[PDB]
Design a protein around this ligand. Structure first.
Ligand SMILES: NC(=O)c1ccc[n+]([C@@H]2O[C@H](COP(=O)([O-])OP(=O)(O)OC[C@H]3O[C@@H](n4cnc5c(N)ncnc54)[C@H](OP(=O)(O)O)[C@@H]3O)[C@@H](O)[C@H]2O)c1
Ligand SMILES: NC(=O)c1ccc[n+]([C@@H]2O[C@H](COP(=O)([O-])OP(=O)(O)OC[C@H]3O[C@@H](n4cnc5c(N)ncnc54)[C@H](OP(=O)(O)O)[C@@H]3O)[C@@H](O)[C@H]2O)c1
Ligand SMILES: NC(=O)c1ccc[n+]([C@@H]2O[C@H](COP(=O)([O-])OP(=O)(O)OC[C@H]3O[C@@H](n4cnc5c(N)ncnc54)[C@H](OP(=O)(O)O)[C@@H]3O)[C@@H](O)[C@H]2O)c1
Lengths: 466, 467, 466, 97
């Protein structure tokens, strides 16, 4: 270690000593940003998840604190003219948090709730999710308080062009590669890409999420669902002594893109998806959904925009239960894949699932499992695969999109899928090894926290802590 | 969904007669903007007429097409240089950067006294849609100068190339504009220009294609167009003729240059029998075909000796020469015709001969070999015609693979480049078939090439906000 | 007017209607930045000072609101290694608020209290002070929460070099020209300039406050005090029909640079400075301070850092009064120059000064006169010269430094002094004309607000409101 | 030069900058927005502008530019949209020196 002299704290520490030092760090962060409620909470949660590391060496807490300040934040006025001809002014942001492992990488959100505190919390966490993919990507987040609701296509184009007119000054294929998020989908990525190309006079991979006709990648629609199943499959192999999805009844929540493609990949591995759900309720097939049944569901959700209940018209064996969660299904469940929304799986749901025989949970959505539900699973020895690792398939394929642009070569769908699978294999092994190394064996939540943090921390010291 | 609908004045379906009128209004508008650019007006007209089925589904595509007809950027610049006598000379340089929707401007440079803006605009406009067909991320462009290489010493061409690149370097780059060779710009000129660009930019990047393999060049460049023609026809035979192949097929090839030579070689790899070669003096014929050994002898005669096809009889007792006649006149059954000589070489009478002789498919190695009247004969006879803009795009496709190798900083083996070229022709053939079936009629590959090339640019143009 | 269609609000409005609209604007600013207390107050105060303008045309209220959003804010981590060899991380800022009239211009502050709210409030007001100078300068402000107190020269050098390592990316002679402020004096300007020149490999006027040996200007130390006296001198001539400083007893508060050089220029104009003050009390000379006496006072304050009472050892005629303000002095006072701090001159002080014969007040400090003190002076018809105009001499000379750097020519001290006097001559005339046009004749406070704002607003519309 | 008019429809105009000679200084010359504008006219004005600018004795070269954009019948906002789009490309080729 060539950076040892730079840090004051050193050596092992007890749990109470770690809590005191973490409290001092949190208070320091609060004084710097007294009212960034979301950012303070994110710093607190990540720090507490790193206690096993901090007990081995307190130097890592000081490194963690130095990582908590963004390298660069740009806020800017965005003037644009609406269809009535009136000048409107919105605020744009790009939080470039850390570039230790690669260019700043992270999505853009257009929503009236957007502010600096929210983007700092999302960008801070994005550093460590991107680290987990094993790809050379840093962490960032951006967006605007622009509200797409009620806006014409032309107004979104005017805003997008003005937004990128400033943003282009600060981004680039080797500097910062933004992506989509809430309020920033295919329409907005295309409008911004066109503006960026016109101003820079170049065709480069400065945005991900692009259409395959101009620099985009295959597997993007399937990325998050496929990666979730790959990760659970490898955790089953590594931690459950050669276990697999084969023959396992899998309760899936949600019926969007994540749930649909997770079900498809579960079937490829021999698993049996038994449920899908939406806000109205869940449907249940006692002997499972087949690929043909999933295709019918996909048509209903993506074309007709129907409820899951419509599927009973196409299957005589299907049952619908209104106003209920998929976790309520009366049958043995071996695997739970919450793929709908945050806080969808609460303590009571976890107690049901344990009794039904659930051995592993894979989070496709963001923060689906409540803290109390996670405690129930941990006490019962039910493995939980954290979303920060398990739903990283989308950001993983965005990194593969960067590689394809750098190579000026479009990969086949099969090659992208093989690359994604190898990424999820190494991520699962790194989570297992990190957890075992720090004396919390089988705790994949801790293993994901440690593996993401440590690669950034060690690389940061390698680079001189600049 | 449709995010650009509100931007377009023309919209909705239209009859064939309505489309014909709108095309006339577009042509007249293009003429008024550039009254004396005869070649460019003709190019706009020919491409427009090939897209009538698309315009009938939605007139917005005609408005997109008109907007694509205006270059994003044209740079004209004085090029001063000093000749071997010590006298100052001034020539005009051009770079037409026509469209970058699908990727960096891509297109060759031409040094010839005939060069002017109208010619470079017609070549650059059509190049947008051929480069789209390669499936690679390449835009469209063209450039050059009225500098005349004839009579010039090596040092004088070096002097001009350096001054020309002194200005051009300001407007090009590996992610912006990647020029290539053309008439008057071969390896000598590519080498001289690359040295000047490297010196001024202080960088080693793939800003030109056609480079020597020792510094950034690619294998398969000599063979690219001939091999790609045969790859394309082979895939059309399998997909549209229910598993048919080159195997066992007697192949009448016209021309005896690089396209014809390497097309014959790949025909043999696939089991076909090339029976003819030709030049302006006549055609030679082998009743039992040419072998690779025989093609090798012919290549030496043409590329070194600069001889006529008749010289080959000196090396083969089975060969026969027929003066002042086309290869299509050969008296024997021909299953595949590959015109690889020049435009308008296959006329109505030749097509009528070929149908009676048993021709099932035509593959265009040359540019516009088949006359309009010959194409109508083939259509009635159900003889597939593979358009040249798709079938002879192998050369530009390999130029794209050269960019890929430079971006990756890795020189591929001959075998890897060849596999990639074959895969490009497979996806191009599928796209032509699918576009023809969806928009005009199954098996009309000429219509499918026009539609597939245009639509990828037009849809991407709308994705990007029409900027 | 080519931008009329862009604005939703237009046309004249009553005073009460304008009050409602201003409240709506304040609420919008509040929701955008809920906890930026200093910035909200700055926007409120400037808006209320422009109410006469809004009454003629509400479009000016929409323009004012669009100006309240910075064009660009850059925040960045500043890593540096202290003398103990420990890595320290501070936050750096540059608020580039507005560039309508010229490059962003404004000082840098190194002080532990610095945050985004404070720099935005100072940067916003800097737009309109710089506009008043008549020079082509926009508005900005920057700095860091770095605390110079207790730091070695080498530690300040290390921080300055790391700070400018990032800042240089966003500034330039035609883009943004920072200057000094609290915590950033000659030492810090020199360290930052050396780093900027080394990285940019160029010698340009990208900082002001430079030493005269390398791009600096004369009159920089004296600029604010001299400019205050020039401004009052011209207001006395223009609004009081040929009055002047000659023969006038001048009560000055404070004993720092502004008070010292204002006193010297008062003597040059035939005035008599009678008082100086500091936190401990005020000193009084019944027959006034001479230039020699001011030189002694300057040595006591700038060297030795003594109290004003120490001057009594050098003058038998001097009198010291502990725990009192200069305004309490028992003698006729003709001119008041508050040069100490904000809110130092309250209602009771104004009532004293009117009785002592005060005809004009010139603000050397920022907002020295309380609103109730201003009410007293208006009733008595005592002119108040607002600080935003009267203390603009420092920024005016910073603009003259830019002109000298652009011309690659060092002006003589006399030429700089002449241009500074002409600037104050035009500034005073512009303030009076603005007040007359809007029917607030003789209200120099309103005239300064209107003249500063209108030049920016009209130029902003000229340029397409981008 | 692509720009969107007040009806929301995309319009395409041609922009030009003829940088004729910089021997005595930066290219100097006006911009003309008129439906008659084409390369021949701008070259004739730009060529002559070299020598008028020379006569001033100041360090100015010669150029001329503009567009076939027609201001007549256009709203203030439509002119703003075209001007911003026109300068979006032109800025790449101009500068104070
Ligand atoms: N796909 C990605 O790569 C990606 C990226 C970022 C975040 N995510 C996260 O993943 C989750 C959704 O992924 P997605 O792309 O599949 O989104 P999606 O296409 O909108 O599908 C979400 C599914 O969850 C259901 N859902 C929402 N609230 C529910 C509730 N209270 N109870 C039951 N079902 C509910 C929705 O049904 P309704 O139709 O009734 O709403 C829908 O079927 C969210 O947590 C999201 O933030 C995914
Ligand atoms: N190779 C490429 O990169 C490429 C790509 C796309 C399209 N093409 C097109 O393909 C055609 C040939 O290309 P290439 O590389 O083979 O050129 P090449 O080396 O000049 O060969 C052309 C051949 O055609 C013959 N020919 C010319 N006019 C003829 C006529 N009226 N009747 C019969 N034969 C005639 C020539 O014989 P003479 O010596 O008697 O003229 C020569 O043997 C041209 O249309 C070219 O533009 C080439
Ligand atoms: N100089 C400039 O160009 C410039 C730039 C920006 C703002 N200003 C404003 O101008 C004012 C002073 O400028 P300066 O450079 O002369 O500052 P300075 O060098 O600190 O002098 C300030 C003087 O005011 C005195 N003072 C402070 N609080 C006082 C109080 N409550 N009662 C009496 N005296 C008090 C100080 O005495 P102690 O030593 O006892 O505190 C000192 O003598 C401030 O309002 C400042 O914000 C000036």
């Amino acid at each position: 270690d060539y950076t040892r002299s730079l840090f004051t704290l050193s050596g092992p520490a007890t749990a109470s000593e770690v809590e005191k030092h973490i409290q001092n760090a949190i208070e320091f962060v609060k004084r710097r940003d007294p009212d960034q409620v979301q950012f303070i909470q994110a710093f607190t949660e990540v720090a507490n998840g790193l206690a096993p590391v901090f007990q081995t060496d307190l130097k890592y807490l000081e490194i963690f604190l130095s990582l908590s300040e963004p390298e660069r934040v740009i806020t800017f006025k965005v003037p644009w003219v609406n269809d009535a001809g009136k000048l409107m002014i919105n605020r744009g942001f790009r939080v470039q948090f850390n570039s230790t492992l690669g260019p700043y990488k992270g999505g853009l959100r257009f929503h009236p709730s957007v502010n600096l505190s929210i983007l700092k919390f999302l960008g801070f966490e994005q550093i460590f999710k991107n680290s987990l993919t094993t790809l050379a990507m840093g962490g960032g987040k951006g967006g605007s308080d622009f509200d797409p609701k009620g806006k014409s296509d032309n107004e979104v184009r005017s805003f997008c062009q003005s937004f990128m007119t400033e943003l282009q000054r600060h981004i680039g294929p080797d500097t910062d590669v933004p992506a989509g998020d809430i309020g920033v989908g295919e329409r907005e990525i295309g409008f911004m890409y066109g503006q960026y190309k016109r101003l820079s006079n170049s065709s480069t991979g400065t945005l991900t999420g692009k259409d395959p006709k101009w620099g985009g990648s295959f597997i993007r629609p399937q990325a998050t669902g496929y990666g979730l199943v790959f990760f659970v499959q490898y955790i089953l192999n590594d931690l459950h002594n050669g276990d697999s999805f084969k023959g396992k009844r899998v309760a899936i929540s949600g019926s969007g893109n994540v749930a649909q493609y997770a079900a498809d990949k579960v079937i490829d591995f021999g698993g049996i998806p038994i449920t899908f759900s939406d806000s109205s309720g869940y449907i249940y097939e006692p002997n499972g959904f087949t690929k043909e049944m999933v295709t019918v569901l996909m048509e209903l959700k993506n074309i007709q925009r129907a409820r899951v209940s419509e599927f009973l018209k196409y299957s005589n064996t299907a049952k619908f239960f209104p106003n209920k969660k998929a976790w309520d299904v009366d049958t043995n469940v071996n695997v739970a894949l919450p793929c709908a929304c945050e806080n969808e799986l609460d303590k009571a749901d976890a107690e049901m699932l344990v009794k039904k025989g659930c051995i592993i949970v894979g989070e496709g959505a963001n923060m689906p499992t409540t803290p109390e539900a996670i405690s129930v699973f941990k006490a019962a020895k039910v493995t939980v695969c954290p979303g920060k690792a398990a739903n990283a398939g989308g950001v993983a394929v965005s990194g593969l999109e960067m590689s394809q642009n750098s190579q000026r070569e479009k990969w086949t769908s099969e090659k992208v899928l093989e690359k994604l699978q190898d990424i999820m294999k190494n991520m699962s092994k790194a989570c297992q090894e990190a957890a075992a190394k720090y004396n919390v064996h089988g705790d994949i939540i801790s293993g994901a926290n440690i593996a993401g943090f440590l690669k950034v921390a060690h690389s940061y010291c390698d680079q001189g802590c600049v």
